[PDB]
Design a protein around this ligand. Structure first.
Ligand SMILES: CC(=O)N[C@@H]1[C@@H](O)[C@H](O[C@@H]2O[C@H](CO)[C@@H](O[C@@H]3O[C@H](CO)[C@@H](O[C@@H]4O[C@H](CO)[C@@H](O[C@@H]5O[C@H](CO)[C@@H](O[C@@H]6O[C@H](CO)[C@@H](O)[C@H](O)[C@H]6NC(C)=O)[C@H](O)[C@H]5NC(C)=O)[C@H](O)[C@H]4NC(C)=O)[C@H](O)[C@H]3NC(C)=O)[C@H](O)[C@H]2NC(C)=O)[C@@H](CO)O[C@H]1O
Ligand SMILES: *[C@@H]1O[C@H](CO[C@@H]2O[C@@H](C)[C@@H](O)[C@@H](O)[C@@H]2O)[C@@H](O[C@@H]2O[C@H](CO)[C@@H](O[C@@H]3O[C@H](CO)[C@@H](O)[C@H](O)[C@@H]3O)[C@H](O)[C@H]2NC(C)=O)[C@H](O[C@@H]2O[C@@H](C)[C@@H](O)[C@@H](O)[C@@H]2O)[C@H]1NC(C)=O
Ligand SMILES: *[C@@H]1O[C@H](CO)[C@@H](O[C@@H]2O[C@H](CO)[C@@H](O)[C@H](O)[C@H]2NC(C)=O)[C@H](O)[C@H]1NC(C)=O
Ligand SMILES: *[C@@H]1O[C@H](CO)[C@@H](O[C@@H]2O[C@H](CO)[C@@H](O)[C@H](O)[C@H]2NC(C)=O)[C@H](O)[C@H]1NC(C)=O
Length: 205
C-alpha cells in the first residue's frame, strides 16, 4: 500500500479530436481560468490553444494516499477530482472524459456509492492513479508521469521515449505487473520538473 503521498504528480493526457486545454484543466480541478498554469509543464506546447490530435498534454495534480472504500485494509495513491452530481450522471459518463487515465470500474471501486444509486446531490471523485516513488527503489526519482499505454506501447518503448533506457531495470520496479504489458494499462515514468530536476527523495529515518 502507501503511507503518505506527495504534492506533485503528472498525467499524460492523450489528445483526441476537438479536445482543448481548458477542458483538460477542468477535468483535473485546475479550473479553466487558470489553464495557463499548465504552460511550464508543457514546453513543447508554446500556444496552449493549439494541441495536435495524437499529441499529449501533461497535467499536474496532488497525489494523495487513500483507503479503498469497502475493501480490507487496501490503500492506493491517486489524485481525486470532485465532481458535483446532477440528475442523469453515471460512473461511466464521468469516466469517459478521462479516456484511459481511469475506468468506470475503478471509479465505482474508489467511491462510496453503488453505481445504481448515486444521489443526485452528491459529489463523487474522479480518481487518477499516480506514483510518488520509493526511496528503497531509488533516491533519485520523486516525480512521476501517469502514462496510459496505447497502440503498440510497452514500458520499454515509453521509458526509451523519456530517455530512461539505461535505467529500465529501475523503471520496471516502479511498475509491478506491467513489465509484460503491451498497448493497455497505466505505467509510471520518472520525469523532470519544470526546473530540470527529477526531485530526489529525502533519506528516511
Ligand atoms: C456492451 C459491452 O460489452 N460494452 C459496452 C457497454 O459498456 C456500453 O453500454 C453501457 O454500459 C454502462 C456500464 O455497464 C451502462 O451504465 C449503467 O447504466 C445504468 C442505467 O442507466 C446505470 O444505473 C443507473 O444509475 C443511476 C445513478 O445511480 C440511477 O439514478 C439514480 O436513481 C435513484 C433512484 O431512482 C435516484 O434517487 C432518488 O432521487 C429522488 C430525488 O431526490 C429522491 O426523492 C428519491 O428518494 C431517490 N430514491 C432513492 C431510492 O434513493 C437518484 O437521484 C438517481 N441518481 C442520479 C444521479 O440521477 C438509476 O436509477 C440507475 N438505473 C438503473 C436502471 O439501475 C448504472 O449506474 C450504469 N453503470 C455505471 C458503472 O455507470 C450503460 O447503461 C450502458 N449503455 C447502454 C446504452 O446500454 C455500450 C453502449 O455505450 O457500449 C459497449 O461497447
Ligand atoms: C472544450 O471542449 C469541451 C469538451 O468537448 C467534448 O470533449 C472533447 C474531448 C471532444 O470529444 C468534443 O467533441 C466534446 O464535445 C467543450 O464542451 C462541450 O461542449 C459540447 C457542445 O459543443 C457539449 O456537448 C453536448 O451538447 C449538446 C447540444 O445538443 C447537449 O444537448 C449535451 O447535453 C452536451 O452539452 C459537452 O457537454 C461539453 N463538454 C463539457 C465537458 O463541458 C467546450 O465547448 C465549449 O463549451 C461548451 C459548454 C459550449 O459552449 C460549446 O459550444 C463551446 O464551444 C470546448 N471549449 C471551447 C472553448 O471550444
Ligand atoms: C489504480 O491503482 C490500483 C492500485 O495499484 C489498482 O488496483 C489494483 O489492481 C490490481 C490488478 O492489476 C489488483 O491486483 C490489486 O488488488 C488492485 N489494488 C487495489 C487496492 O484495488 C487499480 O487497478 C488502478 N486503476 C487503474 C485505472 O489502473
Ligand atoms: C471523495 O474523496 C473525498 C476525500 O478527498 C471524500 O471526502 C470525505 O467526505 C466525507 C463526507 O461524509 C467526510 O466525512 C470525510 O471526512 C471526507 N474525507 C476526507 C476529507 O479526507 C469523499 O467521501 C469522496 N467521495 C465519495 C463519493 O466517495
Amino acid at each position: 500500500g502507501c503511507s503518505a503521498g506527495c504534492d506533485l504528480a503528472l498525467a499524460s493526457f492523450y489528445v483526441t479530436p476537438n479536445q482543448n486545454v481548458t477542458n483538460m484543466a477542468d477535468l483535473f480541478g485546475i479550473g479553466a481560468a487558470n489553464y495557463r498554469s499548465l504552460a511550464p509543464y508543457n514546453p513543447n506546447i508554446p500556444n496552449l490553444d493549439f494541441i495536435n490530435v495524437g499529441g499529449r498534454v501533461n497535467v499536474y495534480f496532488t497525489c494523495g494516499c487513500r483507503s479503498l472504500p469497502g475493501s480490507p485494509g487496501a490503500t492506493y495513491l491517486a489524485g481525486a477530482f470532485p465532481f458535483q452530481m446532477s440528475r442523469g450522471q453515471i460512473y461511466t459518463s464521468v469516466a469517459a472524459n478521462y479516456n484511459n487515465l481511469t475506468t468506470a470500474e475503478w471509479l465505482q471501486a474508489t467511491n462510496s456509492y453503488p453505481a445504481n444509486n448515486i444521489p443526485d446531490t452528491a459529489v463523487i471523485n474522479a480518481t487518477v492513479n499516480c506514483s510518488c516513488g520509493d526511496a528503497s527503489i531509488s533516491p533519485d526519482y520523486g516525480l512521476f508521469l501517469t502514462y496510459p499505454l496505447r497502440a503498440e506501447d510497452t514500458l520499454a518503448s515509453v521509458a526509451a521515449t523519456y530517455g530512461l533506457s539505461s535505467q529500465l531495470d529501475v523503471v520496471r520496479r516502479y511498475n509491478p505487473g506491467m513489465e509484460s504489458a503491451t498497448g493497455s494499462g497505466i505505467v509510471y515514468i520518472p520525469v523532470k520538473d519544470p526546473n530540470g530536476s527529477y526531485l530526489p527523495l529525502k533519506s528516511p529515518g
